[PDB]
Design a protein around this nucleic acid. Structure first.
Ligand code: MG
Ligand code: MG
Ligand code: MG
Ligand code: MG
Ligand code: MG
Ligand code: MG
Ligand code: MG
Ligand code: MG
Ligand code: MG
Ligand code: MG
Length: 90
RNA sequence: CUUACCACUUUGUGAUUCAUGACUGGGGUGAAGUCGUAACAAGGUAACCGUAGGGGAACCUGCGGUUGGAUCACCUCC
């Protein structure tokens, strides 16, 4: 009810977190510490081998990971996290 | 002798019913004829129902309806 309205808090694309994953998909993972709030980070990201990476492979459930916010969709209510960025730039 | 009632019988106009009739509508059956291929597979434009218009023929097209229809819907929110 409350949290989505004042989502300025971590709005800036540059902002980064450490959140904890809930479950995996095969297109992402979802990393949800913010509580009542949850990102995704798509399988495109998480690696520098594009999709040559199953989410299960790089990360597993109940596992904390550093991530930047990239895109918040105020309405439609969906945040786009990035995991390949908060670690190396080879 | 006469009046009344009344059978035979006569006339007029209807109803119903059987037969027959130039010509004409469709229906059934038929190894091997002609024209095509409408349906059954997504039957090669999914089919079908009501209705309307059109076309040698099966049919075609419009409007609404039905599933008694294959394959079924798009990058990332559980
Ligand atoms: Mg015939
Ligand atoms: Mg046919
Ligand atoms: Mg028919
Ligand atoms: Mg077809
Ligand atoms: Mg057909
Ligand atoms: Mg055809
Ligand atoms: Mg007709
Ligand atoms: Mg026509
Ligand atoms: Mg129709
Ligand atoms: Mg109805």
């Amino acid at each position: 009810e409350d949290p989505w309205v004042a989502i300025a808090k971590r709005y800036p694309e540059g902002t980064k977190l450490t959140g904890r994953v809930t479950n995996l998909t095969d297109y992402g993972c979802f990393v949800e510490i913010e509580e009542g709030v949850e990102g995704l980070v798509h399988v495109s990201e998480m690696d520098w081998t594009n999709k040559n990476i199953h989410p299960s492979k790089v990360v597993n459930v109940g596992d904390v990971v550093e991530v930047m916010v990239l895109d918040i969709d105020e309405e439609r209510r969906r945040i786009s996290l990035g995991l390949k960025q908060c670690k190396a730039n080879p």
